[PDB]
Design an enzyme around this catalytic site. Sequence first.
Site, mmCIF file in Angstrom:
data_model
loop_
_atom_site.group_PDB
_atom_site.id
_atom_site.type_symbol
_atom_site.label_atom_id
_atom_site.label_comp_id
_atom_site.label_asym_id
_atom_site.label_seq_id
_atom_site.Cartn_x
_atom_site.Cartn_y
_atom_site.Cartn_z
ATOM 1 N N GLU B 235 0.906 -1.036 0.028
ATOM 2 C CA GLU B 235 0.154 0.078 -0.084
ATOM 3 C C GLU B 235 0.847 1.350 -0.042
ATOM 4 O O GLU B 235 0.848 2.252 0.816
ATOM 5 C CB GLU B 235 -1.039 -0.173 1.083
ATOM 6 C CG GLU B 235 -1.914 -1.518 1.159
ATOM 7 C CD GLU B 235 -3.214 -1.193 1.857
ATOM 8 O OE1 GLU B 235 -3.277 -0.411 2.800
ATOM 9 O OE2 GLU B 235 -4.257 -2.126 1.458
ATOM 10 N N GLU B 340 -4.338 -9.073 -1.093
ATOM 11 C CA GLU B 340 -4.718 -8.761 0.630
ATOM 12 C C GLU B 340 -6.303 -8.461 0.265
ATOM 13 O O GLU B 340 -6.460 -7.661 -0.360
ATOM 14 C CB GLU B 340 -4.067 -7.544 1.178
ATOM 15 C CG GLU B 340 -4.415 -7.273 2.359
ATOM 16 C CD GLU B 340 -3.804 -6.227 3.138
ATOM 17 O OE1 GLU B 340 -2.688 -6.113 2.861
ATOM 18 O OE2 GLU B 340 -4.431 -5.326 4.163
ATOM 19 N N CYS B 342 -10.133 -8.437 3.324
ATOM 20 C CA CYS B 342 -10.636 -8.829 4.550
ATOM 21 C C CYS B 342 -11.929 -7.895 4.745
ATOM 22 O O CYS B 342 -12.249 -6.988 3.903
ATOM 23 C CB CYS B 342 -9.722 -8.387 5.787
ATOM 24 S SG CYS B 342 -8.983 -6.630 5.866
ATOM 25 N N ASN B 368 -13.026 -10.979 -9.063
ATOM 26 C CA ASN B 368 -11.810 -10.933 -9.457
ATOM 27 C C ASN B 368 -11.463 -11.930 -10.481
ATOM 28 O O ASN B 368 -10.732 -11.562 -11.599
ATOM 29 C CB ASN B 368 -10.914 -11.120 -8.207
ATOM 30 C CG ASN B 368 -10.563 -9.983 -7.459
ATOM 31 O OD1 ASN B 368 -9.495 -9.360 -7.453
ATOM 32 N ND2 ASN B 368 -11.584 -9.719 -6.444
HETATM 33 C C1 LIG Z 1 -4.571 -4.167 4.298
HETATM 34 C C2 LIG Z 1 -3.184 -3.363 5.037
HETATM 35 O O1 LIG Z 1 -2.153 -3.976 4.302
HETATM 36 C C3 LIG Z 1 -3.226 -4.219 6.365
HETATM 37 O O2 LIG Z 1 -2.120 -3.947 7.315
HETATM 38 C C4 LIG Z 1 -4.446 -3.847 7.103
HETATM 39 O O3 LIG Z 1 -4.471 -4.723 8.502
HETATM 40 C C5 LIG Z 1 -5.917 -4.396 6.508
HETATM 41 C C6 LIG Z 1 -7.059 -4.225 7.089
HETATM 42 N N1 LIG Z 1 -7.394 -2.715 7.071
HETATM 43 C C7 LIG Z 1 -8.238 -2.140 6.664
HETATM 44 C C8 LIG Z 1 -8.434 -0.796 6.682
HETATM 45 C C9 LIG Z 1 -9.157 0.473 6.428
HETATM 46 C C10 LIG Z 1 -10.817 0.274 6.239
HETATM 47 C C11 LIG Z 1 -11.231 1.597 5.461
HETATM 48 O O4 LIG Z 1 -10.314 2.359 4.752
HETATM 49 C C12 LIG Z 1 -10.763 3.320 3.961
HETATM 50 C C13 LIG Z 1 -10.785 2.882 2.281
HETATM 51 C C14 LIG Z 1 -11.593 1.894 2.061
HETATM 52 C C15 LIG Z 1 -11.609 1.302 0.551
HETATM 53 C C16 LIG Z 1 -11.809 2.523 -0.309
HETATM 54 C C17 LIG Z 1 -10.910 3.597 -0.043
HETATM 55 C C18 LIG Z 1 -9.426 2.873 -0.308
HETATM 56 C C19 LIG Z 1 -9.227 1.786 0.658
HETATM 57 C C20 LIG Z 1 -10.259 0.773 0.262
HETATM 58 C C21 LIG Z 1 -9.262 2.240 2.055
HETATM 59 C C22 LIG Z 1 -10.920 3.835 1.478
HETATM 60 N N2 LIG Z 1 -7.299 -0.465 7.740
HETATM 61 N N3 LIG Z 1 -6.464 -1.964 7.652
HETATM 62 C C23 LIG Z 1 -5.695 -3.841 4.959
HETATM 63 O O5 LIG Z 1 -5.631 -2.377 5.246
#
Ligand SMILES: *[C@@H]1[C@H](O)[C@@H](O)[C@H](O)[C@@H](Cn2cc(CCCOC[C@]34C[C@H]5C[C@H](C[C@H](C5)C3)C4)nn2)[C@H]1O
EC number: 3.2.1.45
Lengths: 497, 495
Positions: B235, B340, B342, B368
């Site tokens: 990321e 990745e 979740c 996907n």
């Molecule tokens: C992947 C990351 O590499 C891991 O370290 C992390 O633990 C894992 C879990 N996770 C989720 C989140 C944030 C959830 C909301 O974020 C906003 C968002 C949502 C989607 C649209 C837009 C771009 C992204 C996808 C983020 C705004 N933080 N950790 C994973 O992040």
Amino acid sequence: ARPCIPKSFGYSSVVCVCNATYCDSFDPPTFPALGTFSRYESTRSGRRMELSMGPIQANHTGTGLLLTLQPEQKFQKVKGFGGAMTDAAALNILALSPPAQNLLLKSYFSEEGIGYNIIRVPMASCDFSIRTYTYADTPDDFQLHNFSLPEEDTKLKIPLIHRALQLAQRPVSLLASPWTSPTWLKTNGAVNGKGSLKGQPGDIYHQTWARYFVKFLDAYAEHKLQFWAVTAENEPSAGLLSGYPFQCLGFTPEHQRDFIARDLGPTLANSTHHNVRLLMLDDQRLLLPHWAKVVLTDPEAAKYVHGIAVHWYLDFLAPAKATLGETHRLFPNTMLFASEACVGSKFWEQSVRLGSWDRGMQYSHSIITNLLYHVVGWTDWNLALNPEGGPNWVRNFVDSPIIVDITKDTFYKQPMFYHLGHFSKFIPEGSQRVGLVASQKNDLDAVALMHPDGSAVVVVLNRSSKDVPLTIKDPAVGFLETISPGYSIHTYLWHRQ
Amino acid sequence: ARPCIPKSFGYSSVVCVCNATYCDSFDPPTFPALGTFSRYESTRSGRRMELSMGPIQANHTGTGLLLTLQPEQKFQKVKGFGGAMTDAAALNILALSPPAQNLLLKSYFSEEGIGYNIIRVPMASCDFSIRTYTYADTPDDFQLHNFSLPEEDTKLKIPLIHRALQLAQRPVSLLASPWTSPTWLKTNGAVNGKGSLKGQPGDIYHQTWARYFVKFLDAYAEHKLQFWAVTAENEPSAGLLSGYPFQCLGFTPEHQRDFIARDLGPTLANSTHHNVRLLMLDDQRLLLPHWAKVVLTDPEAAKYVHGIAVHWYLDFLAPAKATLGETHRLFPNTMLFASEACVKFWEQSVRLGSWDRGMQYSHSIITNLLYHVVGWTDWNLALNPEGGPNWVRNFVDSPIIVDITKDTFYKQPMFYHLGHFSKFIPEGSQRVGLVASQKNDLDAVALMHPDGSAVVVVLNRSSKDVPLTIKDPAVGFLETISPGYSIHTYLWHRQ
Ligand SMILES: *[C@@H]1[C@H](O)[C@@H](O)[C@H](O)[C@@H](Cn2cc(CCCOC[C@]34C[C@H]5C[C@H](C[C@H](C5)C3)C4)nn2)[C@H]1O
Ligand SMILES: *[C@@H]1O[C@H](CO)[C@@H](O[C@@H]2O[C@H](CO)[C@@H](O[C@@H]3O[C@H](CO)[C@@H](O)[C@H](O)[C@@H]3O)[C@H](O)[C@H]2NC(C)=O)[C@H](O)[C@H]1NC(C)=O
Ligand SMILES: *[C@@H]1[C@H](O)[C@@H](O)[C@H](O)[C@@H](Cn2cc(CCCOC[C@]34C[C@H]5C[C@H](C[C@H](C5)C3)C4)nn2)[C@H]1O
Ligand SMILES: *[C@@H]1O[C@H](CO)[C@@H](O[C@@H]2O[C@H](CO)[C@@H](O)[C@H](O)[C@H]2NC(C)=O)[C@H](O)[C@H]1NC(C)=O
Ligand SMILES: *[C@@H]1O[C@H](CO)[C@@H](O)[C@H](O)[C@H]1NC(C)=O
């Protein structure tokens, strides 16, 4: 005019402090001779809609970015700008002493403030309420004999709307949106969660829900308030999600199409409120153009739909061109309107950040993107919140342009307020977006409009840390030599003859 | 061989309870006789990969939904399926008694479990860690004389990876991804927050960082583990954000392009680890196709990039055609790989027995697969009932939840939704066309195994049972039903 009293709360910029006896304000607008421009400037460093004037000259001393006005390239006309009179906003405003209330309302609604001409009105309770209620909570009341407005409407929202309209010289348009129906009209029997109207379009549940819109418009008309428009439902997609935490009512695009064609359209058309417009969707732009194709390709639904309402909150899921642009291309005679023009507070930040320049830039950046993609108007969400971003009966990740501190009879005007004002104050209803051509690739956001009287307005946002030297060319007048400082927003106004 | 022991935690479905002496498992894989089909079913009502067999009919009549196989319409070849051996996952697994550890690893990695053939390995600490170390925390150690693997690698991750591979019959591919560099390589001098490598591509900071990747691969190779691939950064868009709460390292697409071309590409190519592949992006697909255009139009970067790694957050929906589809169209010889995924601040981080979260997994894998993606990698293999541990309390759900106090682990609906793909789509499987005869509420995908046999997965996200037929012109008609809130995998020989 009174200047900003700045206060820092440790974020990137300052709030402007207002109280019972002091609020920053403008002199009446006053525009100079041909060959002169007005500029209003706001900066992260602390300048707040400061006015200067300068020349538009025959000679072009600038060697950098040139933006050329193209007044013959004509796009959408603007309906206007405002915010939402939620229970939360009304409780916050009314907890100030009356002189402070008057200064808060003038900040938004007076020509000496930022000239709002739209108010969004929830139809009964939403997340920004201190309780769950509808207008018809007594069940099995299919003729809605027991429909009534509570204190939230009759004591808080309606009196503040009257005061807002009294302060405004500009005509104000009212927009209504419902979150939930009475729970006895719903499949799940709850104000929230996964739940739609019982039964099917045409039936007694759908007719009753359509009649509720008319009862709502009748009740506000008895209080000398008329609506420009209603939406078919706030975020209809929310009510299709298992566990949705606050007030909702689920519609698939097909159910919205059929509810409009069979119930809401014909019901509004047979009422004394037949002039009130109907906007569809009132939801995330990622649902475009699909939602618009499902509803608007059915002529029996299309005939009742004036426009498409979009929400900003999840704009990051889909770009403007694929959603707003494609929707305009497919349905060029149905206006796009931003009915919930608020941005999400990143999960690691608090809901309210007093003095956040970043949150101000997110507002001006979205307004410019919207204007470049056919959008005719904007309603912000809550007009005012408390420093916790409340009151709210669930939990929310949102700021507001005005934060009220009851305990000190003071209110704080956020950078968001001034970023909104750079548009709302200087783009009256009927203004038309026109061409503005960039001479070369650049980091600025800019848009040009022409007022009804033919005068020019240009907004320039610099989200970068670097000062950008800038020329603006009006073919009819000449060259405006200026600078867009890092972390600035400018509005330029000039006569063209 | 052993069925699910169901337990309700009061949500929409059940978990399967495993302990030191019991876990649900399959018999060794069999194939249905020519003229017959196999069906594996999981339901919200509690069936867990239940096996049945039906006849393939020469004839079909009716107006009911038909899905027709297009075996000559060939798309992407599958790399595989798996999840991430984080510090949190390994700590939770190794807190079980040894026999329970063995049944957990078998659930994922055995032919008697769901046949995982991917493991994603963080390069040092992430949010799913209990502290914030890198491999080279001595300030200004540009020669990396103090590079070393801590106990998180040598006592937790590496031993579990060895055991996973010993259980797997299929070859397993290891994928490595870094969250942060050492702080002394970063503009902001912190593991988190907004910050990118100091200086410019080609310089001492960028060369040290690229040599860090080789030191990592050297140290894993000393422990007899080899990597299939590395990502250029987990990321990279995260470290461009002020206040980003956990380990990150910011790159613009231009910075990624130039780091790969000047430093990471050449350094890997000149190392004894030159066969290790490089995936770019390793981030959310909204960054496509722009990120792919920036990197891959520069032939000096392109020649080092094997693939594009994508992430998603399964509570959200994003366009797939405009991101994954357009990227494939521009760059058809550069594989797309989901590295990745979740799963509502209102719902707990862990919802034991959530059928909804299962359907989010299988919907995402089908989306996907329908847009060129060759592989799909879960996040943490295992978490505790709080969704941890996680040093910033960024708790999420996992297909296996470990209850240390009970020496128990719970296989969530997510584990079975994943298994419906991982167990039945070996590496080398090729996706093929599957046309619906009418609009329908089903997600479906078809592939052919290397040996020519067929596999179709069908998910029903509606509450309505849907009669349907699958037509394969080589054999005839599979008459079946998709119950509401079911997932089915169908297998048949074609000759
Ligand atoms: C992947 C990351 O590499 C891991 O370290 C992390 O633990 C894992 C879990 N996770 C989720 C989140 C944030 C959830 C909301 O974020 C906003 C968002 C949502 C989607 C649209 C837009 C771009 C992204 C996808 C983020 C705004 N933080 N950790 C994973 O992040
Ligand atoms: C690990 O989990 C397994 C499986 O759930 C547990 O085994 C099960 O143990 C229970 C005891 O509660 C057995 O139930 C009882 O069985 C007897 C004998 O048939 C019967 O008469 C009772 O009516 C009752 O049903 C159950 O048979 C058994 N299942 C199997 C396959 O062994 C085991 O106890 C767990 N281990 C630990 C340490 O908790
Ligand atoms: C618009 C809405 O109409 C207003 O009521 C609301 O106050 C406002 C701001 N807002 C939203 C939030 C929290 C987010 C609500 O959940 C969004 C959701 C919905 C599903 C998909 C995705 C992931 C989860 C499930 C959460 C996004 N706080 N203030 C606007 O929403
Ligand atoms: C309302 O805010 C105004 C401006 O900040 C305050 O007015 C100041 O009052 C002090 C007396 O304490 C004077 O010395 C300053 O000159 C005033 N400034 C101006 C421009 O008038 C006023 O104090 C505030 N009211 C309260 C109750 O704090
Ligand atoms: C770094 O390595 C040197 C030389 O091998 C050693 O003496 C020292 O203990 C190490 N420093 C740390 C912090 O481990």
